[PDB]
Design a protein around this ligand. Structure first.
Ligand SMILES: NC(=O)C1=CN([C@@H]2O[C@H](COP(=O)(O)OP(=O)(O)OC[C@H]3O[C@@H](n4cnc5c(N)ncnc54)[C@H](OP(=O)(O)O)[C@@H]3O)[C@@H](O)[C@H]2O)C=CC1
Ligand SMILES: NC(=O)C1=CN([C@@H]2O[C@H](COP(=O)(O)OP(=O)(O)OC[C@H]3O[C@@H](n4cnc5c(N)ncnc54)[C@H](OP(=O)(O)O)[C@@H]3O)[C@@H](O)[C@H]2O)C=CC1
Ligand SMILES: CN(Cc1cnc2nc(N)nc(N)c2n1)c1ccc(C(=O)N[C@@H](CCC(=O)O)C(=O)O)cc1
Ligand SMILES: CN(Cc1cnc2nc(N)nc(N)c2n1)c1ccc(C(=O)N[C@@H](CCC(=O)O)C(=O)O)cc1
Ligand SMILES: COc1ccc(CC(=O)O)c(NC(=O)c2ccc(Cc3c[nH]c4nc(N)[nH]c(=O)c34)cc2)c1
Ligand SMILES: COc1ccc(CC(=O)O)c(NC(=O)c2ccc(Cc3c[nH]c4nc(N)[nH]c(=O)c34)cc2)c1
Ligand SMILES: O=c1[nH]c(=O)n([C@H]2C[C@H](O)[C@@H](COP(=O)(O)O)O2)cc1F
Ligand SMILES: O=c1[nH]c(=O)n([C@H]2C[C@H](O)[C@@H](COP(=O)(O)O)O2)cc1F
Lengths: 506, 506
């Protein structure tokens, strides 16, 4: 009685694993994973057995695998005894003889094609499933991985990796069949109420926790956002704000995202990446004209730039969509005397973005690569004070550019997915202009809140198991950061869940 | 064969537990802890046995404890059979009969005085130790808790609590006698090098981890600082900076501290709390004159305000200790035209601190309680750009004031302990002036680094097991935040380890 595990690499949506007798992709790291996961053993005097179908045995050149014993399922192959590393059985049930005897076999792995996978799950022989999810769907398949039965639950999901602009994940599925520290903390939590800080940061309940079966393997960095939703639903205080829509709010959170091997664009919901870019380049250019975004069919600033809203906050003198000195006016003309959105501000104010790029490549290890937008002298003129307030940038020893961002107020339903992708793109732009690679992205949040009209929507989003992040590459190398265009961005391998409509609070 | 645990409340340094036949303190929550920890059982048809000495039996009024059986050790007490909840034995060894039989007893607890504690550890009967560390030392004791033998290791340390301005902790000591997820992560860490973000955030080794035996019970919030040191020693990249002293640096960290039940003043090192306050009130008053701190025997700004340093950074025109527009000049006179440190700036610039206090009590649930010091128009005039760059404040539903702080660069050896206590005091000041209680303190750090001449010192600090945080209360209620004085601060229960000398990099 030992362990039996399935090893498979399937596509993310349709679970395709083969085409025309070979693999539909070439990922080197996945083959290394297959080697290390099938060679992983505890006894040096024992070997592992790899069960595979005959057609898979043909696709690997009919040659043995080092340090392992291959078990081929076939009705026609001669049961040869010359090769001790290759044995042939007539059916999958009889091949389960590494259990009954052969104590020199420690672990059993199922690697065969669709027929072997389907018959191993149907006859209930499989204990574990090692799945490599590949982000390739618009190609042709003829061999698929069968649907994972409900008796299996995921326990691990790795971060997204990249090979030749292809995103892929690693997951583990398991078949579902000291207390002294926990008890003491509970007793202290009964004596002290909310005086114990742990009771103010309660672990989210299972009903609001995305994919609860993954407890110790929440490596995929989309959980950094999803678990933040769960933490708010668990501890968020019902509070009113300047809008008529109340929120559930907590204070002091953070999220980490990798940018070396993937692009942190949420997969549990279709995110409007084009509107995100158009807003970012609108900041970079130094523009505060709200019409330029509406002319490009981007209406994210329409609510905070209407005639009724502007007059309500005391800016009735302002033109229709003139938002005032905001992001991109403190970036390029900090402390500049603002008149209207039509005047020429070239030369006035401090150009932080220019000096930032200049300092990033002339003094990389400097500890002052800071871009700020909080200007107390201009807040009264702003249609909306800065939410993403201050950002800092960091050049690693291996020439990577990381970014920290502090956000005073975070609309988790709408603003947060935009802010994650926006500053991810901006860090990539700064990396190309300064000659670096993307690093890490950390976002530190003040008032993290959820609007009460987003509860049904965000709970729906929490029911969706995350998918591997896509890749985002630039088609050309620009000479100035202001020259970026939407056509220069290529989004590779983005297969999200359907979009979720949520209303913005004005 | 069942479990035997010691329950004791001893002082932090001398381990005193009694005086004149009674306790040297009155902590209600500790008695509730004794009740819940000794009533904690799994079988409802069983009881717990509490072994105690005769003098302890006298101190509790010689009356039984609800739902439990008291075992008194005495050579003279009559072995009475009338009371089934109280039994008398002639020695501690014979009292260990709840093991040999009496299957109606589930757990055994040792609660007696010094004689019972010493004989229970000497004869090696104890499996677990529940210790309440009380921060009271300058009083008289006549009964002590014996030294914990080396066969025990701590596994849990709770946050610091407060009762009648007395700090206390809860600790658990233990006697020292799935893998599939860990193996897969290791294999992925061998295939991918530093492309896997987990390998850039390696868990600190045991040799640089403060109190390594506490794995799952690192609740004491001083670990938020100590573990940050360990994380830097493990992953810090050797980098040069504007000073001649290189650092080991990582990017993107955070620390949480409670301020409701304690004051986050580090105990693993004696921190100059007086210099911290004098610097904070120096900021609040709006002062930039470096001599006013030197006149009060505070020399933390002497290095960055010398004639040699000022001329080296291009400010030779400046007077000796004129630091320029820095903290407290952006706080009270933001965007004000700076001349010298002797001019009158009353009325010029934006007074953020005044408007902050005004907004905190007139609109508490506002999401814009922000105090910033990063002024790109004044950086060239500063002797040193702001390290603690921006802070945000938050009023909870139960009228508590929390604080978030973003710090671009963090000297973990010198600056970090000052910044933790400084903004903790400032949050308490703002709470009293606005009529709130202290809440939580979160510090988000950009470039967290350790100077290479602090390696020997900080490793010494990591060898010291933390002690409960002290309490800090104000002696009077001021009418203006500028009226605070050092005599108004009372530091209760601060018993730190000896101070550690570290040189500042100029
Ligand atoms: N992405 C991945 O992880 C993997 C992908 N693949 C891909 O899958 C494709 C091939 O797999 P697939 O088409 O499903 O073929 P298989 O690998 O499943 O092999 C099928 C053969 O196994 C024998 N066999 C299967 N079931 C039985 C049975 N119940 N009794 C007796 N013999 C049986 C038969 O051989 P016979 O006719 O001799 O009797 C059959 O022709 C290839 O493209 C390959 O690259 C393969 C492995 C892994
Ligand atoms: N902080 C805390 O958690 C606790 C503190 N305390 C404090 O400790 C103080 C009292 O404790 P303490 O002074 O040490 O006295 P003890 O509680 O240890 O009781 C001592 C008595 O137990 C009997 N005894 C002890 N050892 C033996 C033995 N080897 N054989 C036979 N009988 C024995 C003797 O009784 P006899 O003379 O009859 O033979 C002895 O006089 C009090 O102030 C009390 O409040 C007590 C419990 C807990
Ligand atoms: C066609 N095929 C089946 C195949 C391909 N990819 C997979 N990918 C996964 N995740 N799981 C599988 N079961 C799997 N099976 C192959 C192809 C090559 C090797 C192979 O050469 N393995 C070497 C490793 C080669 C190398 O180190 O790159 C080994 O030591 O096991 C095995 C199976
Ligand atoms: C004098 N004494 C010994 C005493 C006092 N403090 C301690 N504190 C600790 N942490 N551990 C001990 N073993 C301990 N022992 C006492 C005093 C009162 C009670 C007592 O009344 N216990 C009640 C609880 C009373 C209440 O709920 O506050 C119970 O239900 O057990 C027990 C022991
Ligand atoms: C979830 O799926 C979708 C689908 C479609 C869209 C619109 C589109 O992409 O065209 C969206 N995104 C938005 O609607 C949106 C609107 C405003 C911003 C910034 C912003 C300014 N002012 C704010 N005030 C508050 N309260 N909150 C905010 O978020 C902002 C960010 C996003 C999301
Ligand atoms: C560890 O035990 C002790 C014992 C005694 C003292 C002195 C005293 O308390 O009198 C200290 N504290 C300091 O020496 C000190 C010096 C400067 C600051 C702020 C500061 C400005 N500019 C900076 N530049 C760099 N690099 N680092 C910084 O930390 C600062 C903070 C602390 C620490
Ligand atoms: O980039 C943004 N991110 C964001 O989260 N908001 C949300 C936060 C809040 O819900 C609202 C305005 O915050 P406040 O009402 O405190 O000014 O806009 C707005 C942005 F522009
Ligand atoms: O409050 C402070 N906290 C702090 O950590 N430093 C340290 C950080 C760094 O070691 C040095 C200056 O940072 P930089 O050289 O990047 O300007 O001062 C200084 C302070 F005043």
């Amino acid at each position: 009685e030992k362990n039996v595990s399935i090893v498979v690499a399937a596509s993310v949506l349709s679970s395709g694993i083969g085409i025309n007798g070979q693999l539909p992709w070439s990922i080197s790291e996945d083959l290394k994973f297959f080697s290390k996961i099938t060679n992983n053993k505890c006894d040096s005097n024992k070997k592992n057995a790899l069960i595979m179908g005959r057609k898979t045995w043909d696709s690997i050149g009919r040659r043995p695998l080092k340090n392992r014993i291959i078990v081929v399922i076939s009705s026609s192959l001669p049961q040869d005894e010359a090769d001790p590393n290759v044995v042939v059985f007539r059916n999958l049930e009889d091949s389960i003889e590494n259990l009954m005897n052969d104590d020199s076999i420690e672990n059993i792995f199922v690697c065969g094609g669709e027929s072997i996978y389907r018959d191993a799950l149907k006859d209930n022989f499989v204990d574990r499933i090692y799945l490599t999810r590949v982000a390739l769907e618009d190609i042709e398949f003829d061999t698929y991985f069968p649907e994972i039965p409900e008796t299996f639950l995921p326990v691990y999901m790795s971060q997204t990796f990249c090979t030749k602009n292809i995103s892929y994940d690693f997951m583990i599925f398991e078949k579902q069949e000291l207390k002294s520290i926990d008890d003491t903390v509970d007793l202290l939590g009964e004596i002290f109420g909310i005086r114990k800080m742990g009771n103010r940061h309660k672990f989210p309940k299972e009903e609001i926790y995305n994919t609860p079966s993954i407890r110790f393997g929440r490596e995929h960095y989309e959980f950094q956002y999803l678990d933040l939703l769960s933490r708010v639903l668990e501890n968020g205080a019902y509070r009113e704000n300047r809008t008529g829509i109340s929120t559930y709010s907590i204070f002091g959170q953070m999220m980490r995202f990798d940018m070396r091997e993937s692009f942190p664009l949420l997969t549990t919901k279709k995110v409007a990446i084009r509107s995100i870019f158009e807003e970012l380049i609108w900041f970079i250019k130094g523009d505060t004209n709200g019409n330029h975004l509406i002319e490009k069919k981007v209406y994210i600033w329409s609510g905070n730039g209407s005639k009724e809203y502007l007059e309500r906050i005391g800016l009735g003198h302002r033109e229709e969509n003139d938002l005032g000195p905001i992001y991109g006016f403190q970036w390029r003309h900090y402390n500049g005397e603002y008149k209207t959105m039509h005047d020429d501000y070239t030369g006035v104010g401090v150009d932080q973005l220019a000096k930032l790029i200049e300092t990033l490549k002339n003094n990389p290890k400097d500890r002052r690569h800071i871009l700020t937008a909080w200007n107390p002298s201009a807040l009264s003129q702003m249609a909306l004070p800065p939410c993403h307030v201050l950002s800092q940038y960091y050049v690693t020893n291996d020439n990577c550019l990381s970014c920290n961002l502090y956000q005073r107020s975070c609309d988790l339903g709408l603003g947060s997915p935009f802010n994650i992708a926006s500053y991810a793109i901006l860090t990539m732009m700064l990396a190309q202009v300064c000659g670096y690679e993307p690093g890490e992205l950390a976002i530190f949040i003040g008032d993290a809140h959820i609007y009460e009209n987003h509860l049904t929507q965000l709970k729906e989003q929490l029911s969706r198991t995350p998918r591997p992040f896509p890749q985002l590459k630039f088609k050309r190398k620009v000479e100035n950061i202001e020259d970026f265009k939407w056509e220069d961005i290529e989004l590779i391998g983005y297969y999200p869940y359907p979009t979720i409509k949520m209303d913005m609070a004005v």
